[PDB]
Amino acid sequence: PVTINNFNYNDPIDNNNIIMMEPPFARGTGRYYKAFKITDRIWIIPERYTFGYKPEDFNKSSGIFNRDVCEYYDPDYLNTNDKKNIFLQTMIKLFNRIKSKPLGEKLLEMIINGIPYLGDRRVPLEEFNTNIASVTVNKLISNPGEVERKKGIFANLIIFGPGPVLNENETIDIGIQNHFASREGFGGIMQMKFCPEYVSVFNNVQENKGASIFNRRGYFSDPALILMHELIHVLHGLYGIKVDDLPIVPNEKKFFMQSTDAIQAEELYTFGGQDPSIITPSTDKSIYDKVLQNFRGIVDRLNKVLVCISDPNININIYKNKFKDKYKFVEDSEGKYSIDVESFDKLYKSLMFGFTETNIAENYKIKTRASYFSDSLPPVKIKNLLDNEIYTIEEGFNISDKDMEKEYRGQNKAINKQAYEEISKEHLAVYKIQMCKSVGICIDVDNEDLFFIADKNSFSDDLSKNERIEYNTQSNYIENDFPINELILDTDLISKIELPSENTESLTDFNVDVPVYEKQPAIKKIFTDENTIFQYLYSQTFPLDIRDISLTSSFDDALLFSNKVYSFFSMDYIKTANKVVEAGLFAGWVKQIVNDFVIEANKSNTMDKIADISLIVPYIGLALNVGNETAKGNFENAFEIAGASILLEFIPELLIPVVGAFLLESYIDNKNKIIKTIDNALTKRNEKWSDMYGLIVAQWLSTVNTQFYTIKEGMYKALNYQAQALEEIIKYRYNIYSEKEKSNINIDFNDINSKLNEGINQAIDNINNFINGCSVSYLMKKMIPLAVEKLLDFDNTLKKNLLNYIDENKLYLIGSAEYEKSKVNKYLKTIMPFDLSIYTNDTILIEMFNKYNSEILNNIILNLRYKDNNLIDLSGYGAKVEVYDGVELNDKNQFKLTSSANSKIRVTQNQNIIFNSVFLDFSVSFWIRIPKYKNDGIQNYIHNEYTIINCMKNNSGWKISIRGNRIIWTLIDINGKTKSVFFEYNIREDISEYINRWFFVTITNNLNNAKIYINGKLESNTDIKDIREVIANGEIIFKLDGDIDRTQFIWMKYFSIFNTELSQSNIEERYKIQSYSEYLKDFWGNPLMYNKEYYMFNAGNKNSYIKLKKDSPVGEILTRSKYNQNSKYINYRDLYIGEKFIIRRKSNSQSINDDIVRKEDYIYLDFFNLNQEWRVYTYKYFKKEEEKLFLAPISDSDEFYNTIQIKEYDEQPTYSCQLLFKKDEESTDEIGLIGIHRFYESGIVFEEYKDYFCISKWYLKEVKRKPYNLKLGCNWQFIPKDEGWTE
């Protein structure tokens, strides 16, 4: 167990547990410090840490020590005996809290027993030298007022009070002659500057601190966790594993880049969580090797140590036994020490990945910041840690009987205000970048608000080095993980070996290197005329001495006038916000503008499914203008085109090394070693893929995800500024009124703020999801593929290497010169899929990844869309698309392939996308419109098959072809084996749903079947289990290829490819999404237009058509004529028959040019009667259920309704529309829907039934039924002449 001693500052010096110490950095010259032994080998010195600091630097100034910290200064802290005693009792309480749990008690025991080796790099292997500043520290025995007698003592840790900056805790190791024992396996006396009362504050980006933008946000730290964080650094320094290696360094070449000190891997390990993932597997192994090498040196020393010259009283065996246990070396029957790989591996991982702030926080149920790279906030002062009503050894601030155990309420600033006090900003120093415009206006920006972007020098290039493949070579992986539970239960982890006595000979060699610290300017001037995130955020604020503001959508005016505040919300919102009303209308206006705010904020849930983008926050560009001028133009459109990339402030230059070659060692004649060598190269190859991926992840986390973090914080500040601005206006307007008026105004500010805050929280969640999606998108589409390229290239090179090796050694492989090549061929075939969880176990990162992978749209590897008069790939993988001159394109995303040699599209797909999942797994979807056969060319139409889309590489691939009325999907594997599945629509139908009409096609492929879906429905299926590998990323050629008629053509739209099999559910959804339009369609599926001649079709009476009756102002219904020739293969009913109707716009006299007919539009349904344009009317006064429509010349009569509203009652995709007559546009009085009705006629000679063009109220109720009745006689379609249909 661990015993924590008790004592008061005024207790007498006894030269044993209470001493007068001569600190290492004192160089043995004057001034001793009263020190207290809190536990064995651990001392507390309740005084400010002054080594290396100027006395005046303890006062707040115009300077700062660290550029990434809100520094608090207070030269009076610890300036009295009573203050020193409070510090002591507080440290005693914190150590008790630490050992209150096994994990922390274990940390303390490891630290107490991790005694520094007796010596350093300068000591002969055969000796123990205690006479060095990193091993022995002196205590003054003599009476006060005389350095008469001094005694030496061994120590592990000395904790001082804070240096100039109270909240800047730090652990310091001892360097002598430019070298650090604590970094070379020996370990050495560790020192710390610590302050328990002034703790850091942090706030979860995703999590909302009690969700209260008007109250204090964030959480304050548990000083016991802060202490344990530093103790972990102590632990590393004591075991001499605080090695230096390739550090993470921030890029500082641009004015928007955050400046910080270099960050060593050890610091990130200490924190834990996701931070270790920023240290590449390459650097992880480099550090492991350095520490292991350091331990080899110590184990050698233990085998050679013979004497201790400095202290004749040192018992050599006792120390050898102790050091053997410290480093977990093994000892043979004769006392020979050696390194045990298993024990070393366990010790190393326990020290680097077991004891981490994250792991400890989780075990002690203490809340802490999410990452070392989170923004720093001003600290707070804990009122009294010695008061058990506020802080306890067992629970810290989160005391259960105070109901503050849940959700870490005890550390919540908005909830546990009784626990802390805010700090005087007067004593705070913060490093700021002053961005001033050219002559100039200047804006101060806290260095913490800038973008942290790791420089490329931060990452290891070890992957570019060559590797020797021996027969015993093995691949190595260092898991940045460690079972915290096994650590807590690990028996032999803790020493049961006697701790040697601390008294030794006095130190006489005080040689030591003492750090010198200096403040630097707290403000750095930089010139820039850029208006990026910092300026946009700034334009949304107003001075404290101003209370009357107005909102504006003009960023420039907002900058210029102190009374103008920028807003990225709608024009209307801005207008209403600036509205002034009478007291009697104030409450109404408040409810209105507050509601408007919530509506505006909520636009953050905007969907864009037609562009294959599920979520998009439309106003991000206007709010921050971050990245590539995102405030200009339409953000949604700019995003559909370039994606996540447009939001980045800086595109990083990634390190993606050419993997070094493999040098397989030769073992002539020996066959066993030769085979082993082969396999080792293979397994090592995988280590290369994994390490490369780790390299990518590390860079993504420290150069890309960091920028997206800044953006998330920026949107939080932006939305808050907006709410604050609206609140300022509401207050100003309310205070203009008299007290008498105010008394009659029904307003509740707490409710106003509650509503504004809730809207912000909703917006924040959407924004966080959107941004995380963008970040992962960039990783998967803009980073991983670049790595895959290098890795595939490496594979090819190695393949050649190995095969050859098999050849030069075939004379030793006897009956395996074949078996080995096969194993190699298949191995370098299946590539390694990227799995983020392999490089990190952080919950938010993993769920971020899993979410992205669960969204079917991220499986799109090709998405040809129209943009700026051209077809381009918006999938995000950057396919090269060459559209030749003979391809017709329009803004409706339709493209036409003709019989011309230059009517072609060439697509070069990205070769670095995991398309080969070993087994076929992909889908292709697109819309198509195939022209009707030429009646005099039916034989060739049914006989000649022609390809339309071909994707082949090395004689393998897929293709889409057509043979008359059949569309065919064909696969060809590497062996030339072929299989096809097809859809054939009937060409003998009176009325076809497919011929010359737009329809949706979807082809899915999995390991077993190949199926074709048409308009969301499964139509055909083929068993393709016998199909071997199919190369599918070859060049895609869109072009009619075969024996086609010169008039042959094909229209296509929305061609896309998914690297997975779409489900019937996904397909049905895509069909509905791509079918949607505000406008109605015509018979062929194209947009319905005004001023366009159309024949009319009735879905409920397919073979019927309308004709003006000879001597009657009515439309008689006749039977369509039909295909007349003798071909046995075809049949249809004529479509270009009956009156030629034309649709006219009701309002706006913007002439009769043309335009799109939209649902709900009011129209006139006219038609041509020879040289005149007639109209369709409805006699107003009929009492029956239905009546014949009145067809006559254009004119206005009180007796006839002439206005029609075009409707769409079907909720599912259809080309039918309905026509409604309403009393008038405003009324809700429905006269009826246009249809066909049957009448009985009995004349003097003829007796029969005849159908007429009518209006009927009966349809009104029928169109409400579900599922929609497609057969209703009120369903019409408009047929314009089309080159794709001849009769």
Binding site, annotated residues for Zn(2+): 229, 233, 267
Taking the C-alpha atoms of residue 862 and residue 1011, their distance in angstroms, rounded to an integer, is 20
Closer Cβ to Ca ion, 102 or 483, answer by number? 483
Alpha helices in 842-922 (DSSP H): 843-854
Site string for Ca ion, 673-712 (x = CB under 5 A): ----------------------------------------
Closer Cβ to Ca ion, 644 or 718, answer by number? 718
DSSP code at position 814: G
Closer Cβ to Ca ion, 164 or 273, answer by number? 273
Q: What is the DSSP string of 1246-1285?
A: -EEEEEEEEEETHHHHHTTSSS--TT-TT-EEEE---TT-
Q: What is the DSSP string of 678-689?
A: HHHHHHHHHHHH
Closer Cβ to Ca ion, 284 or 820, answer by number? 284
Look at the block and give the residue holding tokens 């070693």.
673
Q: Which stretch binds Ca ion (CB under 5 A): 271-279, 438-446, 599-607, 791-799?
A: 271-279
Site string for Ca ion, 430-469 (x = CB under 5 A): ----------------------------------------
End-to-end alpha carbon distance in the chain? 99
Q: Which stretch binds Ca ion (CB under 5 A): 284-292, 637-645, 898-906, 1049-1057?
A: 284-292
Pairing of β 71-72 and β 127-128: unpaired
Q: Which residues in the 500-559 window bind Ca ion by CB under 5 A? A: 558
Site string for Ca ion, 208-237 (x = CB under 5 A): ------------------------------
Count of residues of this chain found to bind Ca ion when the rule CB under 5 A is applied: 6
Taking the C-alpha atoms of residue 870 and residue 884, their distance in angstroms, rounded to an integer, is 10
Residue nearest to Ca ion according to CB distances in the complex: 279
Q: Which stretch binds Ca ion (CB under 5 A): 476-484, 953-961, 1065-1073, 1277-1285?
A: 476-484
Nearest distance from residue 1064's CB to Ca ion, in Å? 43
Closer Cβ to Ca ion, 248 or 558, answer by number? 558
Q: Which stretch binds Ca ion (CB under 5 A): 101-109, 256-264, 280-288, 1130-1138?
A: 280-288
* Of 184, 266, 284, 1082, the one binding Ca ion by CB under 5 A: 284
* Of 35, 123, 268, 279, the one binding Ca ion by CB under 5 A: 279
Taking the C-alpha atoms of residue 666 and residue 676, their distance in angstroms, rounded to an integer, is 11
DSSP code at position 257: B
Taking the C-alpha atoms of residue 693 and residue 715, their distance in angstroms, rounded to an integer, is 31
In contact, 1219 and 1233? CB cutoff 8 Å: yes
Q: Binding site residues for D-galactose, as ranges?
A: 1236-1237
Buried b (16+ CB within 10 A) or exposed e, 879-896: bebebeebbeeeeebbbe
Taking the C-alpha atoms of residue 791 and residue 783, their distance in angstroms, rounded to an integer, is 13
Nearest distance from residue 683's CB to Ca ion, in Å? 20
Taking the C-alpha atoms of residue 743 and residue 417, their distance in angstroms, rounded to an integer, is 33
DSSP code at position 125: T
Omega prior to 312 cis, within 30 of 0? no
Alpha helices in 660-748 (DSSP H): 671-699, 705-735, 739-743
Closer Cβ to Ca ion, 480 or 1066, answer by number? 480
Closest CA to 959 of 895, 1041, 1054: 1041
Q: What is the DSSP string of 815-826?
A: GGTTHHHHHHHH
Nearest distance from residue 839's CB to Ca ion, in Å? 7
Closer Cβ to Ca ion, 280 or 1216, answer by number? 280
Closer Cβ to Ca ion, 273 or 759, answer by number? 273
Nearest distance from residue 1061's CB to Ca ion, in Å? 35
Nearest distance from residue 563's CB to Ca ion, in Å? 7
Q: Which stretch binds Ca ion (CB under 5 A): 49-57, 282-290, 786-794, 900-908?
A: 282-290
Reduced DSSP (H G I as helix, E B as strand, rest coil) percent helix, strand, coil of the chain, to 5: 30, 25, 45
Taking the C-alpha atoms of residue 1114 and residue 358, their distance in angstroms, rounded to an integer, is 84
Nearest distance from residue 545's CB to Ca ion, in Å? 13
**C-alpha dist (Å) from residue 312 to 135, 155, 307, 321:** 16, 19, 8, 18
Nearest distance from residue 538's CB to Ca ion, in Å? 9
State the catalytic residue, choosing from 230, 357, 448, 600. 230
Tell me if 480 contacts Ca ion by CB under 5 A: yes
CA-derived radius of gyration, the chain: 40
Chain breaks in the chain (C to N over 2.5 A) after: 439
Tell me if 349 contacts Ca ion by CB under 5 A: no
Indicate the length of the chain as a whole number.
1287
In contact, 232 and 350? CB cutoff 8 Å: no
Asked about 230 being catalytic, the answer comes back as yes
Nearest distance from residue 104's CB to Ca ion, in Å? 25
Q: Which stretch binds Ca ion (CB under 5 A): 480-488, 577-585, 781-789, 1136-1144?
A: 480-488
Q: Tell me, what amino acid is at 977?
A: K
Q: Which stretch binds Ca ion (CB under 5 A): 373-381, 400-408, 477-485, 828-836?
A: 477-485
In degrees, to the nearest 5, what angle opens at C-alpha 452 toward C-alphas 446 and 457? 140
Nearest distance from residue 968's CB to Ca ion, in Å? 51
Q: Binding site residues, as ranges?
A: 229, 233, 267, 1021, 1185-1186, 1236-1237
Closer Cβ to Ca ion, 22 or 284, answer by number? 284
Taking the C-alpha atoms of residue 499 and residue 45, their distance in angstroms, rounded to an integer, is 23
Helices (H) and strands (E) counted in the chain, each on its own, are 25, 63
Closer Cβ to Ca ion, 353 or 1209, answer by number? 353
Nearest distance from residue 543's CB to Ca ion, in Å? 8
Contacts of 253 by beta carbon, 8 Å cutoff, 6+ apart: none
Taking the C-alpha atoms of residue 900 and residue 888, their distance in angstroms, rounded to an integer, is 11
Site string for Ca ion, 549-578 (x = CB under 5 A): ---------x-----x--------------
Closer Cβ to Ca ion, 359 or 858, answer by number? 359
* Of 23, 237, 276, 1138, the one binding Ca ion by CB under 5 A: 276
Nearest distance from residue 668's CB to Ca ion, in Å? 40
| Lookup: tokens for 539 | 């334009």
Beta bridge partners of 1000: 927
Active-site positions read: 230
User: Where on the chain is the footprint of Ca ion (CB under 5 A)?
Assistant: 276, 279, 284, 480, 558, 564
